């Protein structure tokens, strides 16, 4: 019973009730798929945000810059869901940029470092985690990571465009390679989602010649959807993710599907 | 059971067993859909071949190009579907071009009218079809075209490829109006399926150069396609359009979704 | 002397000395080329305006949809210019559409036979334009046509838009026709020029609850533009045509180069 | 006479006398321009390069990946061209990519560092040069990038690939900080070019496997070409830049042309 019944599916990047990964394991769980999370830092506290869950999961530690986590996934993945098991699915839902090279701060004012940094967990990452799972993974599944079409230049957006722009690139070889072990990979570009993260600029954490910006940004958005576009529910994109981890989309590979309300196909 | 149960879905481009649209239509009704299928002029030919099918679904006429045809669709529906009842997708599965602007024939060579018909039919008729049904479609409902990436010209396709550009273009003002209904509107850029009407193709009827020239383009489809492709088997495709009409994609519209391998983002 | 200097360039679309075509022949004389022109109907009238360019050029009358004016083109050319002569430019900046797929009447609304007019001069007469032009042409030469980014909806435009799509493909055939007699064929995209067409518009010929539509929309493109957009000075367009008329971009070919500012590389 | 007469335009990017920017400062100085040449390293031996130029032009030195140079370099550029006097073009020729990264070794096998180097100098140095170089640049003045169409996923390239994804990605926002100022920022995604440190490879240093790879993409590039392709003359690209250089582009701004011979908008 369910879309993703049977299948075990990996889901990452939960750190929040309200970030999109947390959405995407829940309508997992709901369409009878059995996970494995992997956190960050604060497991301690991601522990209890899955503790709201439909179901048990366990939750492994993974820091993408740890090059010797990576080196274990595979086996801890393997003692989650047990011998004779294999992954079906993948789903990478990570980013990450200083404030240097998102926010307020200028386009030629983000040093590399903190630049490298962002692109090494936004974009690098994708690669080495397909790298860590591809060979636990049954042919005829699915990896499939988050974009922000990073087509056009847009205000504040800056280095972490330029890192989404390096994700949809990384993301057509991880396929070539994918193929391989007949697995699909695929980036998922949604809309702007008021997550946490941004919960806090809400107010005008960024200021007004800016937090007004970003705000006539979004709006936009809804303006431009054909079909409307609410920022505050992610469910419309977990139900996209969903839809590219199950078997009704096994032609398409190192693809880009828009689940943004076809903003991105008009003008104004 | 099923991906689409309880979706009313009509289904058009039916001719032959081999065709797309009876792929799409035999894996929408292993699927709980109920069907509504509209077929050309020779109707009493075609009932031979949708009697094949999974379910008995009536058949209606509808010529494109005819006028009166299109304005009668809609109340046709219903005298099959239900009053008060409405559809939930529509698949526009039709395509044609006289061969004096596609195979052989020199690019500059095409008459006019020939090329006239072709959009008529093949890009005009999506935005026909859609402005019938689209007052008896519920929310959150979908149309969906089949398309063959022309982003680029090609030996042979010809004029049959600048129709499709217009197809794409035609798509995102269908999801424009489509919108103030709830209704998406997308296409799928399939790969080469071997059809009836283009097996011989290959077999020779096209002449030794051009018989080379069409096979080179599918040798070096799959040759592309990270999962390979399957030149023979439309249920790739089939699968990809009933995962269009169901609810796990309700993000989507104006927009293109290829369920060709993979094969449009690799270079070589 | 001049950046055109000895070509003889062929420059058709002009009506009045507001539209874009008229400053392209103004600054390709400027440059040193010697022009021939062709015109429509109001050949009495064109006679005037063109009797305001820096040089005399014969003016020879071509209606695009008349097979027998395009069946003379080449012959009278070779007149025009005299015998032992070849062109080495053809520009094509020739559009229509009427405005039952244009202005403020709905999308759904347009009649075949309307469309169908506006795609056979707005499309189809690029592929026989560059078939009569093609055989007098010397290799090396430079065929160009106007193009508007048809690459996603926008209000108003409809149907212009769907002809838009159709030139930039049909763009990509001639190509691989013209460059067998090492001829390259490229659009420009420009972005809103405020000609005599739409000068009439600018008072509220189409009213205001659309007449303000197409106002925010050229007003978007002046604030997107990283250098800016001037919609009252054609000059800009004319200058780029120029460049791909003459041969400092003699590797470029079925492409589209865009003068519109750059704004659309930019989303706000 | 000159298409550059009178404009100081700064090229970087040279080593030996195949390298595209040699030829790029080689046509730009036959027509006029005054120039001022950076190198990376090895100084005092391409000057031994640069003095097989039609002019002698100062040459700075100029490591992208070294602060202090970047920063030194606007005042460096004065003592070189006058004071008071500005800068009307920058070409930015600059790529590199470990081996670990590029050619035969696999893609998740490229550890990040080796990525790092080859992001920060082939896309980061873009933003880098331009944020020190704007403020003393000519109003209408260019800026101009060597790009290589990674749109598709190819093999050997790997990491290369993503670097130029970035650079696209990099260059739309160059130019919105370039408006600012009235400057343009373009980038050239040029054919491929048969170069020095290019050459070797098909000459068997990259083995059977991957010398034949490579061959495959040449041989089928010409192939793709409408007028063709010739990998081992860089005049075509050397006379697209100086184009972008000049005044007959004014208009186009955070966009990519293609120096491919249409290689790009053909699919075979
Ligand atoms: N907000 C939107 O509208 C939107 C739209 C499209 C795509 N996305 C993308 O979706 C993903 C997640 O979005 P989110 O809105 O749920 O935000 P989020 O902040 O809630 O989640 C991002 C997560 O990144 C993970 N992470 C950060 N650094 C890491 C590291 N070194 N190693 C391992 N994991 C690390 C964390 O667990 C973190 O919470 C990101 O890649 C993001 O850019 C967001
Ligand atoms: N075969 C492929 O490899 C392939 C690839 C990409 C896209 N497509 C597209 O898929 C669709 C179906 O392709 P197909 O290969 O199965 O071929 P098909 O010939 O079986 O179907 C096209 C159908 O068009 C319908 N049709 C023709 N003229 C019509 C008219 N006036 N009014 C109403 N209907 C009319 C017919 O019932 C016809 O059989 C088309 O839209 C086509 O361009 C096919
Ligand atoms: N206005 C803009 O902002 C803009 C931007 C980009 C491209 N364009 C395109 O540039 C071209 C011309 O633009 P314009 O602004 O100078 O408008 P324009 O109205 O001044 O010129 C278009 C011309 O089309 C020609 N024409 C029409 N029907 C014809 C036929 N049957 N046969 C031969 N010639 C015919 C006429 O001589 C006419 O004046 C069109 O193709 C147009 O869509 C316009
Ligand atoms: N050869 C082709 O076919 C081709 C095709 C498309 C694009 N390109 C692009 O064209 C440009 C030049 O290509 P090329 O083939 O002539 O190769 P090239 O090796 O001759 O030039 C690249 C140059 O990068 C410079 N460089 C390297 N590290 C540097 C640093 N730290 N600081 C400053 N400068 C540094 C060097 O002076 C070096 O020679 C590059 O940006 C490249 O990616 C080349
Ligand atoms: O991809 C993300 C996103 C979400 C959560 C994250 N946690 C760590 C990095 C990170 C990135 N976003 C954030 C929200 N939007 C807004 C936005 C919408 C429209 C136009 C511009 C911007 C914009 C610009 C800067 C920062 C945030 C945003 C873009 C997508
Ligand atoms: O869109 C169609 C298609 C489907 C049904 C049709 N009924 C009338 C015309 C027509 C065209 N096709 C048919 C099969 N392919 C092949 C093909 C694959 C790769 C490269 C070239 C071609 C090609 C060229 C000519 C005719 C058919 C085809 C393209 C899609
Ligand atoms: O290509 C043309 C154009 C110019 C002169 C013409 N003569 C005959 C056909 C024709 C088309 N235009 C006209 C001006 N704009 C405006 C515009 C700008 C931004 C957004 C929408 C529109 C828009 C919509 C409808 C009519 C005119 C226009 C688009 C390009
Ligand atoms: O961008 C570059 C380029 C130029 C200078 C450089 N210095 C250090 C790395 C580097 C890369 N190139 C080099 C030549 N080609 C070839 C090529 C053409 C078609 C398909 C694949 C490849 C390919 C693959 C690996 C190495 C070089 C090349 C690509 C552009």
């Given at each position: 019973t369910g879309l993703l019944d049977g299948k075990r599916i990996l889901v990452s990047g939960i750190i929040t009730?309200?970030?999109?990964?947390?959405?995407?394991?829940?309508?997992?769980?709901?369409?009878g798929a059995?996970?494995?999370?992997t956190g960050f830092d604060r497991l301690r506290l991601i522990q209890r945000i899955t503790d709201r869950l439909p179901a048990?999961?366990?939750?492994?530690?993974?820091?993408?810059?740890?090059?010797?986590?990576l080196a274990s996934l595979a086996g801890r993945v393997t003692e989650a869901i047990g011998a004779g098991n294999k992954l079906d699915g993948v789903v990478?839902?990570?980013?990450?940029?200083?404030?240097?090279?998102?926010?307020?701060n200028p386009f030629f004012d983000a040093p590399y470092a903190d630049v490298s940094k962002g692109i090494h967990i936004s974009?690098?990452?994708?690669?080495?985690?397909?790298?860590?799972?591809l060979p636990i993974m049954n042919p005829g599944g699915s990896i499939v990571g988050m974009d922000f079409d990073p087509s056009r230049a847009m205000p504040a957006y800056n280095w972490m465009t330029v890192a989404k722009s390096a994700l949809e690139s990384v993301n057509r070889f991880v396929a070539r390679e994918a193929g391989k072990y007949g697995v699909r990979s695929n980036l998922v570009a949604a809309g702007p989602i008021r997550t946490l993260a941004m919960s806090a600029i809400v107010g005008g954490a960024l200021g007004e010649e800016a937090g007004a910006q970003i705000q006539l940004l979004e709006e936009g958005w809804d303006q431009r959807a054909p079909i409307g576009w609410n920022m505050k529910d992610a469910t419309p994109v977990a139900k996209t993710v969903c839809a590219l981890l199950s078997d009704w989309l096994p032609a398409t590979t190192g693809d880009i599907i828009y689940a943004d309300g076809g903003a991105h196909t008009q003008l104004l």
């Open positions: 009730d309200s970030s999109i990964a947390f959405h995407i394991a829940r309508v997992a769980q709901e369409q059995q996970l494995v999370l048990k999961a366990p939750l492994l530690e993974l820091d993408v810059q740890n090059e010797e986590h990478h839902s990570i980013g990450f940029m200083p404030q240097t090279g998102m926010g307020i974009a690098y990452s994708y690669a080495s985690m397909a790298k860590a799972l």
